[PDB]
Amino acid sequence: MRPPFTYATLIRWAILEAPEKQRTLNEIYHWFTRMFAFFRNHPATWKNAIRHNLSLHKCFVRVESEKGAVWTVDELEFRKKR
Amino acid sequence: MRPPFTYATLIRWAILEAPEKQRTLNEIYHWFTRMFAFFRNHPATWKNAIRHNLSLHKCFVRVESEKGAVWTVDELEFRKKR
Amino acid sequence: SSVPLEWPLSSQSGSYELRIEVQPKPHHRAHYETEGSRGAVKAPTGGHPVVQLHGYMENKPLGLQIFIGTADERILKPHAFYQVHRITGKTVTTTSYEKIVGNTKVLEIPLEPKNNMRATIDCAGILKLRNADIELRKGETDIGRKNTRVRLVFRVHIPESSGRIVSLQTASNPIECSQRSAHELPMVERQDTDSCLVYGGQQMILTGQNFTSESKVVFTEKTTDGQQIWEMEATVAAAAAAPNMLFVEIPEYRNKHIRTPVKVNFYVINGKRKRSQPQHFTYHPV
DNA sequence: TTAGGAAAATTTGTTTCATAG
DNA sequence: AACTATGAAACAAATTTTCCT
Ligand SMILES: [Mg+2]
Ligand SMILES: [Mg+2]
């Protein structure tokens, strides 16, 4: 019975998913459409694709904590090395 | 442009959009779930819902900046809402 | 209006002070619903923790309400994965009736003047909730995995003449509730030395459990906030050692240029993750 | 009841092999 | 001709629950 992020939460993310930190109404719509596209196409074994991805990609570095390990993202490890 | 969503991109977002920029595998599962629990229940009338939320809420300000009118988040006003 | 358990409270107000005399053992294996009771929380030597109030002359008896809350950082609240477990019958000196507030179980026990308001928490065991059931509850997002450390929280509401009621809360030392953790995680029982000049170079025999032979004591300095600024390997094993004893050489403090003594924390980390709980040590001025 | 052990279940984190733009 | 994206299988291994004396 998981509650869905309300519109404001989603609408905000859509405005931030844009480097400019500002978007147009149509762009916001497309952010939502892309999200529909995703969860529609991958409603299978996603949880597996999440363990996979965290390990494959180098930008996800598991770090130890006084409590337990947790995942983080090396924003630098991303980008191009062309 | 408008690249499609990838596991890497959503994962990065779920983590970065965390208080301290780090989460457990399980927490990332949770995040994805709430997203599933929306993008499968969206009414065939969401755009109206988005337009509605943009003005209704004082956390989404429209500015005449750049190319055309664009939407933006008044961070602190959004933070209040919670 | 009752006081929400999430609200922290002081241990004393003016002349009123609720203090834990004897803290509980470093670890208590909690039982699951599907099983039998795994006894009451105990105390190191052999007894059970003891709580006492300070500055209460009125002859009316009071109620100390015990409840299991978190430990690991942040604000102390009730623990979403654990519940106190009433223990009564045959033995058990201290008596108690249970109740459930909000979503937490709370035991209340008699705080009577005929015992200078000091009670021995001999009636509270710990029950583990299935991480599964509690993580998918109503709007809750606390991590349950690896989270198996709790604190015996104690509360008492003093009734004054003006009708006022100042609320006092405690918080026992962290307790390890997991059978696996209790077995594989490094434990420090009784230290040996607490002071030393910033220069270093002294022995401090440490005793506890899970002290293998590959142990390696580490030193660190935290802030009033929670930042790190020092982690210095503190070489061990002068030779051999006692199966659960450890002789380490106290490192050399950050800059040794200090006019005012500094208290510090040092733990024990066996396996690449199997860490111990932070300790206390005190350096001295220049 | 009150434990102590530990098998049975769950979960997490890595790699390898194949497919396509 | 790198570089990127997606996914099943099989391990390895860390943790949690259920079972058994
Ligand atoms: Mg990685
Ligand atoms: Mg608005």
- Residue C242: Cβ-neighbour burial (10 angstroms; 0-12, 13-18, 19+): exposed
DSSP state of C117: T
B73, A21 Cβ separation under 8 angstroms: yes
Round to the nearest angstrom and report the end-to-end CA distance of chain A: 45
Helix (H, G, I), strand (E, B) or coil at C106: strand
Kindly report the nearest CA distance between residue C85 and chain B, in angstroms: 28
In this structure, what token pair is assigned to residue C83? 């519940």
Domain of residue A21 covers: 1-82
Helix (H, G, I), strand (E, B) or coil at C269: strand
Contacts of C250 (CB under 8 A, 6+ apart): C193, C196, C200, C201, C202, C203, C204, C219, C234, C281
Decide if B7 and A37 are in contact by the 8 Å CB cutoff.
no
CA atoms within 13 A on the CB side of A36: 13
Question: Measuring CA to CA, how many Å separate C209 from each of C124, C181, C192?
Answer: 25, 12, 15
- The C-alpha atoms of residue B13 and residue B17 are separated, in whole angstroms, by 6
Task: Give the position of tokens 């583990």.
Answer: C128
Q: How far is the CA of C41 from the C1' of D18 (A)?
A: 56
Q: What's the CA-to-centroid distance between C82 and ligand 1, angstroms? A: 33
> Residue B43 is part of a domain; what is its CATH number?
1.10.10.10
Tell me how many domains chain B contains: 1
Task: Give the position of tokens 């070489």.
Answer: C235
| B4 closest CA partner among A45, A30, A4, A21 | A30
In this structure, what token pair is assigned to residue C63? 């109620």
| C193 closest CA partner among C286, C281, C284, C285 | C281
B46 touching chain A per CB within 8 A: yes
Q: How many residues does chain B have?
A: 82
Alpha-helical runs (H) found in chain B: 7-16, 25-36, 46-56, 75-81
Task: Tally helices (H) and strands (E) across chain A.
Answer: 3, 3
In this structure, what token pair is assigned to residue B47? 């755009």
C9, C168 Cβ separation under 8 angstroms: yes
Helix (H, G, I), strand (E, B) or coil at B11: helix
Phi, then psi, of C114 in degrees rounded to 5: -60, 0
Q: Chain C partners of B30 at a C-beta cutoff of 8 Å?
A: 135, 141
In this structure, what token pair is assigned to residue C5? 């358990």
Phi, then psi, of C254 in degrees rounded to 5: -20, -65
Q: What's the CA-to-centroid distance between A53 and ligand 1, angstroms? A: 8
Strand partners, C31: C127
C35, C44 Cβ separation under 8 angstroms: no
If one counts every other C-beta atom within 10 angstroms of the C-beta of residue C58, the result is 11
- The C-alpha atoms of residue B78 and residue A7 are separated, in whole angstroms, by 12
- The C-alpha atoms of residue C26 and residue A79 are separated, in whole angstroms, by 47
State how beta strands C217-222 and C195-197 pair. Answer: unpaired
C220, C267 Cβ separation under 8 angstroms: yes
DSSP state of C114: G
User: What is the amino acid identity at position B56?
Assistant: L
This entry's atomic model was obtained through X-ray
**Domains along the sequence of chain C with CATH:** 5-177 (2.60.40.340), 178-286 (2.60.40.10)
State how beta strands C124-128 and C31-32 pair. Answer: parallel
DSSP H or E segment with residue C195? strand C195-197
- The C-alpha atoms of residue B27 and residue C136 are separated, in whole angstroms, by 11
Helix (H, G, I), strand (E, B) or coil at A56: helix
Q: How far is the CA of C215 from the C1' of D2 (A)?
A: 33
| C273 closest CA partner among A65, A73, A55 | A65
Task: Give the position of tokens 């609720």.
Answer: C18
Kindly report the nearest CA distance between residue C179 and chain A, in angstroms: 16
User: What is the amino acid identity at position A5?
Assistant: F
Give the angle subtended at the CA of C116 by the CAs of C113 and C119, to the nearest 5°. Answer: 95
- The C-alpha atoms of residue C153 and residue C156 are separated, in whole angstroms, by 11
Q: How many residues does chain C have?
A: 286
User: What is the amino acid identity at position C95?
Assistant: T
Q: What's the CA-to-centroid distance between B76 and ligand 2, angstroms? A: 14
- The C-alpha atoms of residue C228 and residue C224 are separated, in whole angstroms, by 11
Resolution in angstroms comes to 2.8
Helix axes A7-16, A25-41, angle to 10 degrees: 110
